[PDB]
Structure formats: structure tokens, C-alpha cells
Amino acid sequence: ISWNGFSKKSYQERLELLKAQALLSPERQASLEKDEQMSVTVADQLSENVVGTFSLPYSLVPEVLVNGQEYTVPYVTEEPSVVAAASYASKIIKRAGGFTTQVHQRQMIGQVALYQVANPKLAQEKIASKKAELLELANQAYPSIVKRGGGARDLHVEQIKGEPDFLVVYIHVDTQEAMGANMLNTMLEALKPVLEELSQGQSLMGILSNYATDSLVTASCRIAFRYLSRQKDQGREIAEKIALASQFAQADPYRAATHNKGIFNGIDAILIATGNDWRAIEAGAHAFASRDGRYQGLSCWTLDLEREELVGEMTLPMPVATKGSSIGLNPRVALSHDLLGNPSARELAQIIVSIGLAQNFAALKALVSTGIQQGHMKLQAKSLALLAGASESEVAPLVERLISDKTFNLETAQRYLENLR
Amino acid sequence: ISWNGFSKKSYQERLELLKAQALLSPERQASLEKDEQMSVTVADQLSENVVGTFSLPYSLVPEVLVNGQEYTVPYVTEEPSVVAAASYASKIIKRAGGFTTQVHQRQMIGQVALYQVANPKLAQEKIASKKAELLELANQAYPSIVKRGGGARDLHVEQIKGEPDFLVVYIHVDTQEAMGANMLNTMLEALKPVLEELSQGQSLMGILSNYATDSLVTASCRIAFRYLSRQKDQGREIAEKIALASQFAQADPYRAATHNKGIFNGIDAILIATGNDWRAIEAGAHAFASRDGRYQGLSCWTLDLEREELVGEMTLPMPVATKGSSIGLNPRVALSHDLLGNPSARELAQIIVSIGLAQNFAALKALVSTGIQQGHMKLQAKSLALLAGASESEVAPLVERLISDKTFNLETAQRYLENLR
Ligand code: NA
Ligand code: NA
Ligand code: NA
Ligand code: NA
Ligand code: NA
Ligand code: NA
Ligand code: NA
Ligand code: NA
Ligand code: NA
Ligand code: NA
Ligand code: NA
Ligand code: NA
Ligand code: NA
Ligand code: NA
Ligand code: NA
Ligand code: NA
Ligand code: NA
Ligand code: NA
Ligand code: NA
Ligand code: NA
Ligand code: NA
Ligand code: NA
Ligand code: NA
Ligand code: NA
Ligand code: NA
Ligand code: NA
Ligand code: NA
Ligand code: NA
Ligand code: NA
Ligand code: NA
Ligand code: NA
Ligand code: NA
Ligand code: NA
Ligand code: NA
Ligand code: NA
Ligand code: NA
Ligand code: NA
Ligand code: NA
Ligand code: NA
Ligand code: NA
Ligand code: NA
Ligand code: NA
Ligand code: NA
Ligand code: NA
Ligand code: NA
Ligand code: NA
Ligand code: NA
Ligand code: NA
Ligand code: NA
Ligand code: NA
Ligand code: NA
Ligand code: NA
Ligand code: NA
Ligand code: NA
Ligand code: NA
Ligand code: NA
Ligand code: NA
Ligand code: NA
Ligand code: NA
Ligand code: NA
Q1: Closest Cα partner for A362 from A116, A143, A64?
Q2: How many interface pairs between A and B have CB atoms less than 8 angstroms apart?
Q3: Is residue A220 domain-shared with residue A330, that is, in the same domain?
Q4: How many CB atoms lie under 10 A from the CB of residue B226?
Q5: Domain range for B412
Q6: How far is CA B177 from the centre of its chain?
Q7: CA distances from B351 to B73, B312, B318, B421 (A)
């Protein structure tokens, strides 16, 4: 069954179409139809100083194709056009065969910072020689994850220079379906005294890192020029401009910020829907954006001229969860996971990066388009009118004729000012 | 009237205390008491493909003192302990005289990227010589903001190198109480054809930038060591460790990400409550964090040893709004603004940066503390037991005695293993 007309349908009609798609159980469908919310009682358990609840829209982005599997994606966003743009981008990319994705690795990194280490290199060697015993100790500290098949997998020690110098111990941990904050903090507390003794130093802190480089996930898409525009060579032109737009975000931090913001319009929307911590994902991705010594766009758009295809690619750290308090307690979060077919965290991560790339595609395409609203046509024609050499009284008649045309440039405004005078 | 006991009070009791504080009008108080939400109808106007609404907790952070003015701050967060930590940090800092804040500048930056410019330097000069006429054209394009006292204030042109090179025109615009996306996009559309003609180039895009460096706002606080701990020299020790924690986030991107994440736990919470676009604020701040060629902590904690004070400081781009669709349409957003005394955007911005710094303070203080939960005490005592040289059977008795003590290190575990053997 088709999703055609979903945006223009009324609220009630959208629910009927969704029901026809048979994506939700009878319980979840009824929960959605009475727009069941997280209660004050539940809110009061989740947070502190609770005096009520706060609501945002909840929307669907249909036809998200990821590794040959189609998803209907839930969005929570208060920004006009974000859902419409994601849905549009998703249709185009589905027609083009959808996204291809890979999880490079899925582990969490935690760190212990040591200071007042007289001999950092000797401390480094000592700790590294005790690697196996330290990992065992970390694993005994949180046995439930070992039983599930996860646990501490690696440990390394680095000298970080500054004022002062720090000796930093990093642990790499398979947290399975959890984000793993509590797990990592617990393992690090256990290691603290041993690491202090081995380094003859003082522990400053033991904490998870939100720079989740053991959780990188890449999405890509491959879009034939003909899907960008049906017109003869207009598709190639759009593709070129998107690639230039991509190059511009690599060059200018002022563009990069906006480029990456647009990606997170979509990413944060699905993160909220699925009960995931968006501050953690924002921080890791924006740090990742800076890795080459400049703040840069998180995605890349290039041309394959031989195959006549526009190629999009994006790698992000995506340590999302399918187990957590919000997932357990917010009835709409539980619904969002069911809606998606209850993906694993790895699967969810691949969907989310794809969503970001779709969102990026729509923003870039709209940004490089030359067909714009009537209000801005009257405005651009006014600029060309004045640029042609028009006086005060000559502006209004010149605009009327310019807007009557399908397309127009300076030479057209000069031609029309010539005839008028 | 005191806020003492606010966290431990029931939901109903918190509402009664709030009512006693007389911060809300009769209408706003009643709206809150029936936990009035943004409706599906309103959600459907805000977003697309709407099939319902999504709820999050709504909390209060009392006693936020900013430039001698006390605020009760609204938070929307699903993360346990974030509100409690902000409230705790806020009490301490209020006792210490609160935050001191300044708005450096409040303007929005928009950009037009030009390519295929044969002579970039001649184009640069030509455009710069037409500066006044270009600003006038931008201002005629959006006359309502000029009437309110805002408008385009400056324009400059830069050569940005890459593959290929871009000639970039930046406009600086006073958008008053608005974020100014529509305003800036409209002014840039008007300038596009003129800039193309002056540069003999092609316009790639005309768009607002979320790297809001014409919107920097700094907060600082100054906390006597005695407020950190009542114990003799323990306050100094805590202050030292916080400053080291701050130095660590300057040195290690893995720490920086987490440091800045913790700041945004608070910032995004108040942004949501006040109907502000958190993706825009996240992007700008995380880009700002990278400005010196490394991704670094957004705040600084230093010691004034002579005055015996811990000093916190943070500068962020904070182009928030007090006019916008969410502010107009979400009944709880309107409530949040009333609750705050209807601050101007500049005033709101100063509150938000202060909130971030408070949130940071609480995270750092907790991170460097050595008094932790019983579960982790049994865990740390086990590590010291094994480290002392205990065998399998010797662990359990050694832990029992170590946890009976108030404080313990390796020498204590060695002493107790000596007595046992
Ligand atoms: Na809901
Ligand atoms: Na509560
Ligand atoms: Na609401
Ligand atoms: Na798709
Ligand atoms: Na696919
Ligand atoms: Na689905
Ligand atoms: Na939405
Ligand atoms: Na939307
Ligand atoms: Na993991
Ligand atoms: Na991590
Ligand atoms: Na990681
Ligand atoms: Na890594
Ligand atoms: Na990885
Ligand atoms: Na991953
Ligand atoms: Na692909
Ligand atoms: Na771009
Ligand atoms: Na984008
Ligand atoms: Na946007
Ligand atoms: Na969430
Ligand atoms: Na959530
Ligand atoms: Na963040
Ligand atoms: Na991330
Ligand atoms: Na992350
Ligand atoms: Na890019
Ligand atoms: Na993942
Ligand atoms: Na939630
Ligand atoms: Na449900
Ligand atoms: Na529900
Ligand atoms: Na799931
Ligand atoms: Na978009
Ligand atoms: Na509400
Ligand atoms: Na809608
Ligand atoms: Na909800
Ligand atoms: Na305060
Ligand atoms: Na103050
Ligand atoms: Na207030
Ligand atoms: Na909250
Ligand atoms: Na909280
Ligand atoms: Na402004
Ligand atoms: Na800006
Ligand atoms: Na700005
Ligand atoms: Na600036
Ligand atoms: Na500024
Ligand atoms: Na500002
Ligand atoms: Na201060
Ligand atoms: Na830190
Ligand atoms: Na922090
Ligand atoms: Na956190
Ligand atoms: Na918002
Ligand atoms: Na909002
Ligand atoms: Na963002
Ligand atoms: Na910002
Ligand atoms: Na910004
Ligand atoms: Na710092
Ligand atoms: Na501001
Ligand atoms: Na809202
Ligand atoms: Na209200
Ligand atoms: Na309300
Ligand atoms: Na206000
Ligand atoms: Na905090």
C-alpha cells in the first residue's frame, strides 16, 4: 500500500493509513490513537523537581530504505519542513536503491586521568604489562554484561601533554544494547586504586567518553542524475552544485556548522523518538567533525561522471541504545522501537546515520535550487531592475514584466528597461 | 519563601510551593496544574506527517542568580540527576553571589558563496566599494525589522581557499528578538543577483550561518573555597581538582566531548522549555569549541589562591529568540517565558550560558569527589585487597573490615591482611 498523499491527509486519515500499513500491534495502534503520553508520575520517576510534562510533535518519515530493508521512521521535531524534507529525501534515495551502511565497531570508551606521575613512561609500561589482569578486574566488577556476551575488551595508556601532563588510561568496552555509562563508571571505579598504585600517581576522574570513536557507522547513497531532475541536463547541474556545497562545508567553518546542524535536525528527531541521549550524539559527532584540525562538514557529496550518479557518504560515532530508562518508561518511545521492527542498537545506528544523510541531501538540494517563492521573485527582479539602471518610477513596471517571464537575468531587465525608455 | 525540600516534596506539593512563590499569573498557574500540553492540532500546524505528540518531563531549577537578578529556570530533560545537579550547582553559586554576565554582541551572520570568479581580489574590492548600497538593498528587502530598529549592519567579503576556491560574502544583521533565519535568507536572495554581477561569478547558495560569532555571551562565577566544603582544607582540594579537570578538557578531545556534553544537558533543557532551536545552539558552540585547531572544553575553571576562590568562565554563541512559532504555539513554552519574567533574548542568553556553567560545575565537582556509593566501596576495597596480596578466600573478610572504616587505602588493606595472616 502506497504512502502517496500522506502529508496532505488529515491527522485522522494519517492514522487510518498507518493502520492499513499494519506496522503496529493492536495495543500500540490504540496507544497512538488516544495519543498516550508519558504521565506526570513517570516523568517524576525520570527527572527531579518535576512540576509537569512538555510535549512536542510526533511524525513519520516513510520509505527509509537501509541495506534493502524498508523502515517507517519516527521523528520528534518542532521545526517546520524538517519532516517534509526528510520524507522527500527518503523517497528519492529509495528510488535510487536506498542506503548502504556498515558498523565499523561498537564499543564504548571510558577513561581514567592520572596526574602527579613522576615517571610516565615507566608507569605506561607497568600498566600495559598488567593489561590482562586489569581487564579481568573490570569484568568482575560488572558480571552481568559478561554473561550477556559483552565486557571490557581492551585497555591502553597514553601520555597527554599540557599544563600539567596527564597519564590517561582508556578502556574499550562491549556494552551490547546499552549506552553503558553506569557500566563504564563502575568498571573505572574498580580500576582506579590499582592504576594509582601502578603509576604511583593520583586519579583525577574515571568517566565514560562521549567521543565515541569505537562506535563509527557509515552510510552512503548513490543517486542517478535523472532522479535529481527529469529535465535533460538539469540533473547533472543539481548534482554539481550539491558537490560544490559539500566542498564549501569542508572549507568554511561558518558553512560547516549550518551543514552539520541540518544533519542533526533529523538525527535528534529520531533520537528523541527512540529515547536516546541526543546531547551525547551531538557532542561526539561535532568533535569528530573537528578531527583534522578544522571544524568541517560531516558528510561528503561527490560525482561519478562515468555512471552519472551523485554519491553521498557520512561516518558518525553512533553509540545508541535499545535498553534504557526512557525506552522502558516513555510509552511512545516503546512504540517507536516496535514501529521500527525492534532493531538492535547496531541496526538502529545504521538507520540514524542514513536519516542524517537523507536530511543533509534535502537541505543541500533546496539550497542550490533556483526555483523559489513568488515573494523572492518580486525581490530578485527588483534587484536586477535597479542594477539595469532603473530610477524610482521605473522599478514597478519593470518588475511586473520580469515576473511574467518564466526565467530572467540582468540582460532581460536591461532589454525591458530599453523598451520602456 | 524558601525552596528547601522542593525535590523531596510530592508533585502536588511542588505545585503548591510554586504557587506560594507567586511567579505565575492565575491563568498560567491553572494551565500548569492541569498539565496543559501542546495539542495534536497545534503539533499538526508546526510539523508535517503528524500522527500525535511526544512528552518529556518539565522541571524547575530554582535560585539561578544572574547579575543580581534571581530566576526560577524551567528544564525539559529525560536524564536522571540533571535537574538535581543544576539545582545544587545553582544554590552554591547563589551563595557565592551568583553569575556575572555580558553580551558582547547580538547579530546574526548570513553568507553567500560565489564560485567561478576569475578575479577574486577585483571582485572583493568591487563588492566592498558597494557596501552601503548592498546594505540598503538588504534592508529594503525586509523593512519590518528596520522599523523595529534592526536590519543589516555590515558586510564583508573573504577569499576562502579549497577545491575549488570560493568568494564568500558575509552579512551581519540585527534581528532583534528573532533568530532571523527567514529574515537573513530573504535579504540574501535580494543580494544574490547583484553579488553575481559585481563578482562576475555564480552564486552557490545564500543562507544563515549557525556559527554565531556575532552572538557571543560570557558567564562567570566566583566561589569561595568554604562553599565547596566546610572541612578545613578540603575546599581548596576540591577547587584544585576542578581546575585540573578543566585543564584536562583542554588537553584531551575524549574528555572535551564529555565536558561539553554535560554543559548541554542543561543548555538544551532550557532551550526546549523556551521553544528555542537547540540544534543551532549545539552546532555553533561545538564549532566554537574547535576554534584554536583542537576540539576543547567550552569552559575554564581557575584558582585565585590569594582570594581563595574558584573561578568559572564560559563564552558561547547564544543567538536565542523570544519570538518564534514554538514560542507562539506551545502553551508550556509561553509559560516558561512568563516564568522567567519575559526576558529579552539578550537576557535569556545570559541566563542560558549561566545555566551551562552551573551544570558544568556540578558535573566537575561530582567527578572529582572521593565519597561514593556503598556498591563502589565494596568494589574498591576488593581491588585494594587483591592488590595487597590476598588469595580467593581472603577477599571477603578483608573487604568487611575495610568498609567498616571511614576511609582506606592500600596500606590499610596491607595492614589488615597482615593481621589476618
Ligand atoms: Na507520547
Ligand atoms: Na521529580
Ligand atoms: Na507542551
Ligand atoms: Na530511503
Ligand atoms: Na538499501
Ligand atoms: Na518500520
Ligand atoms: Na515531528
Ligand atoms: Na517538521
Ligand atoms: Na557497545
Ligand atoms: Na564512547
Ligand atoms: Na566508543
Ligand atoms: Na577508537
Ligand atoms: Na569505530
Ligand atoms: Na556503532
Ligand atoms: Na551507496
Ligand atoms: Na554545505
Ligand atoms: Na545539512
Ligand atoms: Na534548519
Ligand atoms: Na531522548
Ligand atoms: Na526521549
Ligand atoms: Na552536546
Ligand atoms: Na556521537
Ligand atoms: Na557519542
Ligand atoms: Na562536507
Ligand atoms: Na552502534
Ligand atoms: Na523520553
Ligand atoms: Na505505546
Ligand atoms: Na503512546
Ligand atoms: Na529496538
Ligand atoms: Na533538511
Ligand atoms: Na506542556
Ligand atoms: Na502535519
Ligand atoms: Na510521550
Ligand atoms: Na545561582
Ligand atoms: Na549575580
Ligand atoms: Na523567574
Ligand atoms: Na526535566
Ligand atoms: Na533530571
Ligand atoms: Na540579532
Ligand atoms: Na549567526
Ligand atoms: Na552571529
Ligand atoms: Na564575528
Ligand atoms: Na560576538
Ligand atoms: Na548574544
Ligand atoms: Na563572576
Ligand atoms: Na573536564
Ligand atoms: Na560538564
Ligand atoms: Na551526562
Ligand atoms: Na525547541
Ligand atoms: Na520547544
Ligand atoms: Na547540531
Ligand atoms: Na551557538
Ligand atoms: Na548558533
Ligand atoms: Na576546559
Ligand atoms: Na543573544
Ligand atoms: Na515546542
Ligand atoms: Na500556558
Ligand atoms: Na501549559
Ligand atoms: Na521572553
Ligand atoms: Na551536571
Answers
A1: A64
A2: 401
A3: yes
A4: 15
A5: 371-421
A6: 19
A7: 9, 15, 10, 60
Q: After which residues is chain B broken (C to N over 2.5 A)?
A: none
The total of structural domains in chain A comes to: 3
Per-residue three-class SS string for A121-138: HHHHHHHHHCHHHHHHHH
Please give the Cα distance from B14 to B5 (Å, whole number).
9
Phi-psi map region of A97: left, alpha, beta (phi>0 left; psi -120 to 50 alpha)? left
With beta carbons less than 8 A apart as the criterion, state whether A271 and A352 touch: yes
- The Cα A297–Cα A249 span in angstroms is 5
| Residue B364 shares a structural domain with residue B378 | no
Q: Which helix (H) or strand (E) holds A301?
A: strand A299-304
Residues A363, A263 share a domain: yes
Residues B162, B255, single domain; the answer is no
d(C-alpha A78, C-alpha B330), whole Å? 10
Both A285 and A352 in one domain: the answer is: yes
Q: From the candidates B104, B131, B261, B378, give the one annotated as an active-site residue.
A: B261
Neighbours of ion ligand 58 (CB under 5 A): B 31, 36, 331-332, 335
On whether both A335 and A290 belong to a single domain, the answer is yes
Q: Of all helices (H) and strands (E), which one includes residue B331?
A: helix B331-339
In this structure, are residues B255 and B248 in contact, taking their beta carbons and an 8 Å threshold?
Answer: yes
Q: Which residues of A touch B38 (CB under 8 A)?
A: 55-57
Same domain, A275 and A356: yes
CATH of the domain at A46: 3.90.770.10
Cβ–Cβ gap A161/B376 under 8 Å: no
Would you say A227 and A235 are in contact if contact means Cβ atoms under 8 Å apart?
A: yes
Residue type, A344: S
Exp. method = X-ray
Please indicate if the annotation marks B203 as binding a ligand.
Answer: no
Resolution in Å equals: 2.3
Query: Which three three-digit cell numbers place residue A129?
Result: 604489562
Domain final residue pick, B174, B198, B214: B214
- Rounded distance from Cα A275 to ligand 26 centre (Å): 5
Total count of residues recorded for chain A: 421
Chain B residues touching A86 at Cβ < 8 A? none
Long-range CB pairs of B396-401, under 8 A, 24+ apart, other chains included:
none
